[PDB]
Amino acid sequence: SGAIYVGNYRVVNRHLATHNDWANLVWEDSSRDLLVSSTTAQGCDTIARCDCQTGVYYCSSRRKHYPVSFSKPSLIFVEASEYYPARYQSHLMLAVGHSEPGDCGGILRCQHGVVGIVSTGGNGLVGFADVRDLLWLDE
Ligand SMILES: NC(=O)[C@H]1CCCN(C(=O)C(F)(F)c2cccc(F)c2Br)C1
Numbered sequence: 705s706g707a708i709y710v711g712n713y714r715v716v717n718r719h720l721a722t723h724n725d726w727a728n729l730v731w732e733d734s735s736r737d738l739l740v741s742s743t744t745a746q747g748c749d750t751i752a753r754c755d756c757q758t759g760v761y762y763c764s765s766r767r768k769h770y771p772v773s774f775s776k777p778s779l780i781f782v783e784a785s786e787y788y789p790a791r792y793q794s795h796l797m798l799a800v801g802h803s804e805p806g807d808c809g810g811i812l813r814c815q816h817g818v819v820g821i822v823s824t825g826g827n828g829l830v831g832f833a834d835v836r837d838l839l840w841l842d843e
């Protein structure tokens with residue numbers, strides 16, 4: 705679990721979105737595993753606007769933050785699950801690191817701010833759904 709609170713928006717994994725998230729939907733994309741919903745309280749997370757390939761992510765399965773080197777956002781094949789069939793997920797970034805299902809929603813950050821959230825993993829790897837291109841989150 706985990707979310708990004710920026711202004712009047714809440715960013716979550718699309719497969720983990722609530723009834724309230726769908727009732728106040730702003731935008732959603734199955735190919736990215738993202739869903740954005742409106743909120744009444746104001747958020748204060750800063751989103752990075754950069755091309756950093758190093759950062760720190762939070763891993764709830766270990767109660768620890770880990771430094772990681774990660775790839776540039778791209779189309780990567782993801783094994784079928786109870787939420788999605790076998791498909792290519794876009795805007796996905798991989799790193800060598802610990803993750804298990806339940807870690808989805810953990811924030812990845814560089815010095816410039818929030819880069820994205822845990823979305824895939826397995827085999828000693830971790831995938832993060834990028835959010836730096838969503839310029840409308842700030843405006
Ligand atoms: N983005 C997706 O399509 C997800 C949906 C949920 C399922 N999924 C997974 O990767 C996962 F849960 F099985 C997983 C397995 C081992 C380590 C992990 F950190 C994770 Br996350 C794909």
Ligand SMILES: [Zn+2]
Nearest residue numbers: 754756814816
């Ligand atoms: Zn950065």
